[PDB]
C-alpha cells in the first residue's frame, strides 16, 4: 500500500515540476 | 494506522503542490 | 489516542493546504 | 484529562483551518 | 479545578472558531 | 474565591463568545 | 469584602453577557 | 506498477528539463 | 515498455541538452 | 525503435556540441 | 409536540425578520 | 416535518438578507 | 425538496452578496 | 436543477467579485 | 450550458483581477 | 466559443500583469 | 482569430518584464 | 503580422534585460 | 524589417552583457 | 546598416571582456 | 416621469446622507 | 437630465464621505 | 459637464482619503 | 482643467500615502 | 505645472517609502 | 528644479534601502 | 550638487550592502 | 570629495564582501 | 589618503579570499 | 606602509590558496 | 463675537461627551 | 483664546475616548 | 500651554490605545 | 517635559501592541 | 531616564513579536 | 543596564524566530 | 553574563533554522 | 560553556544542511 | 567532548554532500 | 573513536563523488 502511495507522491511531484517550469516559461517571456 | 495516514498526508500535500503549480501559472499569466 | 489525533490533525491540516491552493487558483484567474 | 483535551482543541483548529479554507474559496470565486 | 477550566475555555474557544468558520462560510457565499 | 470566581467568568465569557459565534451564523444565513 | 463584591459583579456581568448572547441568537432567527 | 511509475516520473523530469531550458532561452533573450 | 521510455528520456534530455547550448548562446551575445 | 533512437540522440549531442562551439566563439569575442 | 412549537416559533421568527427588512427599506428610503 | 420547517427558515433568513442589502444600499445612497 | 431550497437559499445568498456589493460602491464614492 | 444552480451561484459571486472590485477602486481614490 | 456558464465565471474573474490590479496602482500612488 | 473565450481570459490577465507591475513600480518609488 | 490573441498576450507579458524590470531598478536604488 | 509580433515581443525582452542588469548594478553597490 | 530588429536585439544583448560585466566588478570589490 | 551593427556588438563584446577580466582580477585578489 | 422621479429621490438622498454626516460629525465633537 | 442628476449625486455622495471622514478624525480624538 | 464634474468627485475623494488617513493616526497613537 | 485636476489627485493620494505611513509606524510601537 | 507635480508627488513616494522603512523596523523588533 | 528633485529622490529611496537593510537585519535575529 | 548627491546615494548602498551582509550572517546561522 | 568618497564605497563593498564570505562559511556548516 | 585606502581595500578582499576558501573546505566536505 | 600591506595581501593569498588546495583534496574524495 | 460663541459651543459639545460616556460606563456596569 | 479652547476641546475628547474605553472594557465582560 | 496639551492628550490617547486593548482580550475570551 | 511624556507614550503604545497581541493569541485559539 | 525608556519600550516590542508568533502558531494549526 | 535589555530583546527575538519557524512547520502540513 | 546569552541566541538561531529546514521539507512534499 | 554551546551550534547546522540537502531532494523530483 | 562533536559535524556533512549529490542527480534527468 | 569516523566520511565523500559522477552524466546526455 505504502510502496504505491510513495510512487504516486513521485510522480504528482514530477508533474508538479513540469507545471512549474511552463509557469517559469510564461514568467520569462 | 499510522503509516498509512502519514502517506496519505504526503499525497495530498503532493496534490497542493500541482494545485500551486496551476495557481502559479495562472498569475504568471 | 493522541497519536492518532496528531495523525487526525495533520491530515486535516494537509486538506486545507489543498483547499488554500484550490482558493489561490481561483483568485489568480 | 488535559493531554486529551489539548488534542481535542488542535483536531477543532484544524477542522477550523479547514473551513476558513472552505471560506477563502468561495470568496474568491 | 483552575487546571480543568482552562482546559475548557480552550476547547470552548475552539468550537467558537469552529462556528466563526462557519459562518464565514455562510457569508462568502 | 477569588481565583475560582476569575475562571468561572473565563468560561462564562466562552461560552457567550460561542453564543455570538451561533448569532453570527443565524445572521449571515 | 470590597474584593469579592468586585469578582460577583465580574461574573454577574459575565451571565449578562451570555444572555445578551441569547437574545441576539434569537433576533437574527 | 512501480517499475513504470519509475519510468514515467523519469520521462516527466526530463519534460521538465526541456521546459526549464525553454524558460531559459526565452530569459537570456 | 521501459526500454523505449528510457531512450524517450535520453531523447527529450539531448532535445533539452540543445535548448540550453542555444540558451547559453543567446546568453554570450 | 532503440537502434534509431540512439543514433537520433547522438546526432543531437552532435548538433548541442555545434552551437556550445557556437556560443562560445561569441563569448570569446 | 414541543418539538413542532419551536420549528413553528422558529419560522414565525423568520417571518418578523423578513417583515422588519421590509420595514428597515421602507425607512432608509 | 421539522426537516422541512428548518429549510424554510433558512430560506426566509435567506430572503430577509437580501432585503436587508436592498435596505443597505438605499441607506448608502 | 431540501435539496433543492438549500439551493434556492445559496443563490439568495449570492444574490445577496451582489447587492451587498452595489451598496459598498455607493458608499465608497 | 441543482448542476444549473449551483453554476448560477458561481456566476453570481464572479459579478460580487468583479462589484467589490469597482468599490475597491473606488475606496483606494 | 454548464461549460459556457464556467468560461463566462472565467472571464469575470480575469476582470474582477483586472480590477483589482488598477485599484492597487491607484493605492500605490 | 470557449476556445475564443479562454483566449480573451488569457489576454485579460496578461494586460493584469502590466497593471500590477505598474502597481509595484509605483510602490517602489 | 487565437493566433493573433497568443501573440498579443505575449507581447503583453514583454512589456510587464520590461515593467517590473523598471520596478526592480526603482527597488535596488 | 505574428512575424513582426515575434521580433517585437525579442527586443522588448532584450530592453527588460538591459534594465534588469541596469537593476544588478544598482544591487551590487 | 525582421533583418534590423534582430540586429537591434543582439546590439541590446551586447550592451546588457557590458551592464552585466559591470555589475559583476561591482560586486567582485 | 546591418554590417555596421554587427562590427559595433563585437566591440561591445570586446568591451565586455575587458571588463569581466577586471572582474575577474578583483575577486582574484 | 418616473425616470425623474427616481433621479430626485436619489439626489434626495445624498443630500440626507450630506446632512447626517453633518450630524456625526457634530455628534462625535 | 438624469446624466446630471447622476453626477451631482456622485459629488453629493464624495462630500458626505468627506464629512464622515472629519467625523472620524473626531471621533478618534 | 460630467467630465469636470467626475474630476470633482475624484479630488473629493482623495481628500477623504488624506482625512481617513488623518483619522487612523489620531486613532493609533 | 482635467489635466491639473488629475496631478491634484495624484499629489493628495501621495499625501495620503505618507499619512497612512505615519500611521503604520504609530501603530507598530 | 504638471513637470513638477509629478517629481513632487515622487519625492512624497519615497519619504512614504521611507517611512514604511521605518514602520517595519519597529514591527521587527 | 526636476534635477535636484530626482536626485533627492534617489537619496531618499537609499535611505529607505538602509532602513530596511536594518529591518532585515532586526528580523533575522 | 547632483555631482555629490550621487556619490551619497552610492555610499549609502554600500551601506545597505554592509548592513545585508550582516542580516545574511545572521539569518545563516 | 568625490575621490574619498569613492574609496569610501569601494572599502564598505570590500567590507560587505568579507561579510558575505562569513555568511558563507556559516551556511556551509 | 586614496593610496592606503586602495591598500585596505586590496587586505580586506585578500581576507574575504581566505574566508571565501575556508567556505568551500566546509561546503566540500 | 603600502610596501608592508602588499607583503600581507600577497601572504593573505598564499594561505588562501593553501586552504583552496585543501578543498579541492576534500573535493576529489 | 461669534467667533467665541462657536468655540464655547464646541467645548460645551465636548463636555457632553465626556458626560455621556460616563452615562454610558454607569450603564454598562 | 480660541488657540486654548481648541486645545482644551481636544484634551476633553482624549478624556472622553478613555471613558469610552473603560465603557467598552466593562461591556465586554 | 498648547505644547504641553498637545502631549496631554497623546498620552491619553495611548491610555485609551492601552484599555481598548484590554476590552478586546476581554471580548476575545 | 514633553521628551518625557513622548517617551511615556511610546511605551503606551507597546504595552498597548503587547496587549493586543494577547487578544490576537486569544482569538485564534 | 529615556535611554532606559527606549530600551524598555524595545523589550516590550520583543516580548509582542512572542506573542504574535504564538498567536500565528496557534491560528495555523 | 542597557547593556543587558539589548541582550534580552536579542534572545526574545531569537525565540520569536524560533516560534515563527513553528508557525511556519504547521502551515506547509 | 552577555557572552553566554550571546551563545544562547546564536544555538536558538541555528535551532531555528533546524525548523524552517522541517519547514521546507513539507513544503517541497 | 561557551565552547561546548559553539560546537553544539555548528553540529545544529550540520543537521540542518541535511534537511535542506532532503528539502531539495524532494522539490527536484 | 567537542573532539567528538567536530567529527560527528564532519560526518554530518559528508552525508549533507550525499543528498546533495541525490538532488542533483535528480534535477539532471 | 575518531579514526573510524574519519574513514566513514571518507567512505561517504567518495560514494557522493559516484553520485556525482552519475549527475554529470545525466546531464551531459
Known sequence: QA???KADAE???A???ILEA???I???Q
Open 3 to 5: 510502496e504505491i502511495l
Open 11 to 13: 510522480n504528482n511531484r
Open 15 to 17: 508533474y508538479a515540476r
Open 22 to 24: 511552463h509557469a517559469e
Open 26 to 28: 510564461l514568467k520569462a
